[PDB]
Design a protein around this ligand. Structure first.
Ligand code: NA
Length: 222
Protein backbone atom coordinates (compact mmCIF):
# COMPACT_ATOMS: atom_id res chain seq x y z
CA UNK A 1 0.00 0.00 0.00
CA UNK A 2 0.84 3.65 -0.80
CA UNK A 3 0.63 5.98 2.15
CA UNK A 4 -1.17 9.30 1.57
CA UNK A 5 -2.71 12.17 3.64
CA UNK A 6 -5.12 12.03 6.64
CA UNK A 7 -4.26 8.66 8.16
CA UNK A 8 -5.09 7.15 4.67
CA UNK A 9 -3.31 4.49 2.49
CA UNK A 10 -4.20 2.68 -0.71
CA UNK A 11 -3.69 -0.55 -2.58
CA UNK A 12 -4.46 -1.33 -6.16
CA UNK A 13 -6.08 -4.69 -6.69
CA UNK A 14 -6.49 -4.19 -10.46
CA UNK A 15 -6.10 -1.57 -13.17
CA UNK A 16 -9.52 -0.19 -12.21
CA UNK A 17 -10.02 -1.21 -8.58
CA UNK A 18 -8.15 0.14 -5.52
CA UNK A 19 -8.91 -0.47 -1.87
CA UNK A 20 -8.13 2.08 0.83
CA UNK A 21 -7.55 1.96 4.62
CA UNK A 22 -8.59 5.17 6.49
CA UNK A 23 -7.45 5.48 10.15
CA UNK A 24 -9.59 7.43 12.55
CA UNK A 25 -7.10 4.64 16.49
CA UNK A 26 -9.32 2.42 14.20
CA UNK A 27 -8.73 1.58 10.53
CA UNK A 28 -11.75 1.22 8.17
CA UNK A 29 -11.92 0.04 4.50
CA UNK A 30 -13.46 1.20 1.26
CA UNK A 31 -12.97 0.92 -2.53
CA UNK A 32 -12.21 3.27 -5.43
CA UNK A 33 -13.40 1.93 -8.77
CA UNK A 34 -12.33 3.85 -11.89
CA UNK A 35 -13.60 3.78 -15.47
CA UNK A 36 -13.01 6.59 -18.07
CA UNK A 37 -11.58 9.02 -15.63
CA UNK A 38 -14.71 8.60 -13.42
CA UNK A 39 -14.74 7.01 -10.08
CA UNK A 40 -17.06 5.17 -7.76
CA UNK A 41 -16.42 5.49 -4.06
CA UNK A 42 -17.54 2.45 -1.99
CA UNK A 43 -17.84 3.69 1.63
CA UNK A 44 -16.35 6.97 2.79
CA UNK A 45 -13.75 7.46 5.55
CA UNK A 46 -15.26 8.49 8.93
CA UNK A 47 -15.53 12.19 8.21
CA UNK A 48 -15.53 14.82 5.44
CA UNK A 49 -11.91 15.89 5.77
CA UNK A 50 -10.54 12.37 5.29
CA UNK A 51 -13.04 12.03 2.51
CA UNK A 52 -11.95 15.28 0.90
CA UNK A 53 -8.29 14.17 0.89
CA UNK A 54 -9.25 10.85 -0.65
CA UNK A 55 -11.48 12.45 -3.28
CA UNK A 56 -8.60 14.88 -4.09
CA UNK A 57 -5.98 12.19 -4.49
CA UNK A 58 -8.28 10.23 -6.80
CA UNK A 59 -8.44 13.35 -9.02
CA UNK A 60 -4.87 14.44 -8.65
CA UNK A 61 -3.12 11.05 -8.71
CA UNK A 62 -5.76 8.89 -10.35
CA UNK A 63 -7.10 11.53 -12.80
CA UNK A 64 -10.57 10.26 -12.10
CA UNK A 65 -13.51 12.41 -11.00
CA UNK A 66 -15.67 10.81 -8.25
CA UNK A 67 -19.12 10.73 -9.59
CA UNK A 68 -20.66 7.82 -7.72
CA UNK A 69 -21.05 6.68 -4.17
CA UNK A 70 -22.45 3.54 -2.63
CA UNK A 71 -22.40 2.93 1.21
CA UNK A 72 -22.38 -0.52 2.79
CA UNK A 73 -24.79 0.46 5.54
CA UNK A 74 -25.56 3.51 7.69
CA UNK A 75 -22.53 3.63 10.00
CA UNK A 76 -20.00 6.42 10.09
CA UNK A 77 -17.30 4.29 8.56
CA UNK A 78 -19.58 4.04 5.51
CA UNK A 79 -21.30 7.40 5.28
CA UNK A 80 -19.21 9.57 7.54
CA UNK A 81 -17.98 11.72 4.62
CA UNK A 82 -21.27 11.66 2.66
CA UNK A 83 -22.07 15.30 3.59
CA UNK A 84 -19.02 16.48 1.76
CA UNK A 85 -19.74 14.14 -1.27
CA UNK A 86 -23.13 15.62 -1.59
CA UNK A 87 -21.43 19.03 -1.57
CA UNK A 88 -19.24 17.85 -4.38
CA UNK A 89 -22.52 16.93 -6.04
CA UNK A 90 -21.79 13.15 -6.05
CA UNK A 91 -24.65 10.82 -7.07
CA UNK A 92 -25.34 8.04 -4.59
CA UNK A 93 -27.20 4.72 -4.32
CA UNK A 94 -27.93 2.71 -1.21
CA UNK A 95 -30.13 0.04 0.17
CA UNK A 96 -33.57 1.83 0.83
CA UNK A 97 -33.18 0.53 4.45
CA UNK A 98 -29.90 2.60 4.70
CA UNK A 99 -31.68 5.70 3.37
CA UNK A 100 -34.56 5.35 5.94
CA UNK A 101 -32.22 4.71 8.96
CA UNK A 102 -30.16 7.66 7.71
CA UNK A 103 -33.21 9.98 7.48
CA UNK A 104 -34.49 8.97 10.85
CA UNK A 105 -31.06 9.59 12.45
CA UNK A 106 -30.72 12.99 10.84
CA UNK A 107 -27.61 11.63 9.01
CA UNK A 108 -26.64 12.48 5.41
CA UNK A 109 -29.07 10.63 3.15
CA UNK A 110 -28.01 8.62 0.08
CA UNK A 111 -29.89 9.64 -2.99
CA UNK A 112 -31.45 6.67 -4.80
CA UNK A 113 -32.64 3.57 -2.98
CA UNK A 114 -32.98 -0.04 -4.15
CA UNK A 115 -34.45 -2.94 -2.28
CA UNK A 116 -33.03 -6.12 -3.62
CA UNK A 117 -30.32 -5.65 -6.22
CA UNK A 118 -29.01 -2.79 -8.25
CA UNK A 119 -26.53 -2.54 -11.10
CA UNK A 120 -24.98 0.91 -11.35
CA UNK A 121 -23.16 1.67 -14.62
CA UNK A 122 -20.02 3.76 -13.96
CA UNK A 123 -19.83 5.16 -17.51
CA UNK A 124 -20.03 1.59 -18.66
CA UNK A 125 -18.47 -0.47 -15.86
CA UNK A 126 -21.05 -2.43 -13.75
CA UNK A 127 -21.19 -2.14 -10.01
CA UNK A 128 -23.62 -4.80 -8.71
CA UNK A 129 -25.12 -4.02 -5.34
CA UNK A 130 -27.08 -6.72 -3.52
CA UNK A 131 -29.00 -6.71 -0.25
CA UNK A 132 -28.81 -10.40 0.87
CA UNK A 133 -29.99 -10.04 4.45
CA UNK A 134 -29.00 -8.50 7.80
CA UNK A 135 -25.53 -9.21 9.15
CA UNK A 136 -23.24 -6.76 10.85
CA UNK A 137 -25.93 -4.03 10.27
CA UNK A 138 -29.54 -5.00 9.51
CA UNK A 139 -29.13 -2.98 6.30
CA UNK A 140 -25.82 -4.23 5.07
CA UNK A 141 -25.30 -4.81 1.37
CA UNK A 142 -22.27 -6.10 -0.64
CA UNK A 143 -20.95 -4.63 -3.91
CA UNK A 144 -19.74 -7.04 -6.63
CA UNK A 145 -17.57 -5.98 -9.64
CA UNK A 146 -18.33 -8.76 -12.29
CA UNK A 147 -15.69 -7.52 -14.72
CA UNK A 148 -12.99 -7.64 -12.00
CA UNK A 149 -14.14 -10.58 -9.79
CA UNK A 150 -13.82 -8.31 -6.82
CA UNK A 151 -16.30 -8.31 -3.93
CA UNK A 152 -16.40 -5.54 -1.29
CA UNK A 153 -18.38 -7.37 1.42
CA UNK A 154 -18.20 -4.56 3.92
CA UNK A 155 -18.46 -4.96 7.76
CA UNK A 156 -20.44 -8.16 7.56
CA UNK A 157 -17.05 -9.75 6.55
CA UNK A 158 -14.07 -10.00 8.96
CA UNK A 159 -10.40 -10.33 7.95
CA UNK A 160 -8.51 -13.53 8.42
CA UNK A 161 -6.84 -12.27 11.62
CA UNK A 162 -10.05 -11.17 13.37
CA UNK A 163 -11.29 -13.21 16.28
CA UNK A 164 -14.20 -11.11 17.52
CA UNK A 165 -17.71 -10.37 16.49
CA UNK A 166 -17.34 -6.59 17.19
CA UNK A 167 -20.24 -4.16 17.51
CA UNK A 168 -23.55 -5.95 17.30
CA UNK A 169 -25.69 -3.03 18.40
CA UNK A 170 -27.16 -2.89 14.95
CA UNK A 171 -26.65 -6.44 13.94
CA UNK A 172 -29.08 -9.16 13.10
CA UNK A 173 -26.91 -11.83 14.70
CA UNK A 174 -28.93 -14.93 13.82
CA UNK A 175 -29.31 -13.73 10.16
CA UNK A 176 -25.63 -12.90 9.89
CA UNK A 177 -24.55 -16.56 9.09
CA UNK A 178 -27.35 -17.20 6.54
CA UNK A 179 -26.48 -13.98 4.79
CA UNK A 180 -22.81 -15.12 4.65
CA UNK A 181 -24.01 -18.36 3.10
CA UNK A 182 -25.85 -16.51 0.32
CA UNK A 183 -22.69 -14.52 -0.32
CA UNK A 184 -20.47 -17.57 -0.55
CA UNK A 185 -23.16 -19.19 -2.84
CA UNK A 186 -23.45 -16.09 -4.87
CA UNK A 187 -19.83 -15.09 -5.55
CA UNK A 188 -17.80 -18.30 -5.77
CA UNK A 189 -15.41 -16.86 -8.39
CA UNK A 190 -14.26 -13.90 -6.32
CA UNK A 191 -10.62 -13.25 -6.69
CA UNK A 192 -10.39 -10.62 -4.00
CA UNK A 193 -12.76 -10.36 -1.04
CA UNK A 194 -12.54 -7.05 0.78
CA UNK A 195 -13.81 -6.89 4.50
CA UNK A 196 -14.97 -3.79 6.51
CA UNK A 197 -11.68 -3.62 8.48
CA UNK A 198 -8.42 -5.41 8.09
CA UNK A 199 -6.62 -7.07 5.22
CA UNK A 200 -8.49 -8.26 2.13
CA UNK A 201 -8.13 -11.87 1.10
CA UNK A 202 -10.30 -14.30 -0.79
CA UNK A 203 -13.54 -16.07 -0.37
CA UNK A 204 -12.01 -17.70 2.74
CA UNK A 205 -12.99 -14.59 4.66
CA UNK A 206 -16.65 -15.59 4.31
CA UNK A 207 -16.14 -18.88 6.13
CA UNK A 208 -13.73 -17.54 8.74
CA UNK A 209 -16.35 -14.79 9.55
CA UNK A 210 -19.16 -17.30 9.65
CA UNK A 211 -17.01 -19.14 12.17
CA UNK A 212 -16.71 -16.11 14.37
CA UNK A 213 -20.46 -15.44 14.16
CA UNK A 214 -21.34 -18.98 14.93
CA UNK A 215 -18.89 -19.03 17.80
CA UNK A 216 -20.59 -15.94 19.12
CA UNK A 217 -24.08 -17.54 18.77
CA UNK A 218 -22.75 -20.63 20.41
CA UNK A 219 -21.12 -18.73 23.34
CA UNK A 220 -24.30 -16.78 24.34
CA UNK A 221 -26.63 -19.86 24.28
CA UNK A 222 -24.81 -22.06 26.93
NA1 NA B 1 -15.93 1.32 5.37
Amino acid sequence: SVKISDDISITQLSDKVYTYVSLAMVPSNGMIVINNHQAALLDTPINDAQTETLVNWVADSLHAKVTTFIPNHWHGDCIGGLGYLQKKGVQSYANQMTIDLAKEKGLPVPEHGFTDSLTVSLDGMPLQCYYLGGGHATDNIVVWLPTENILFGGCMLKDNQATSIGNISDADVTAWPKTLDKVKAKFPSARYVVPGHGDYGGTELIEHTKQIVNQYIESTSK
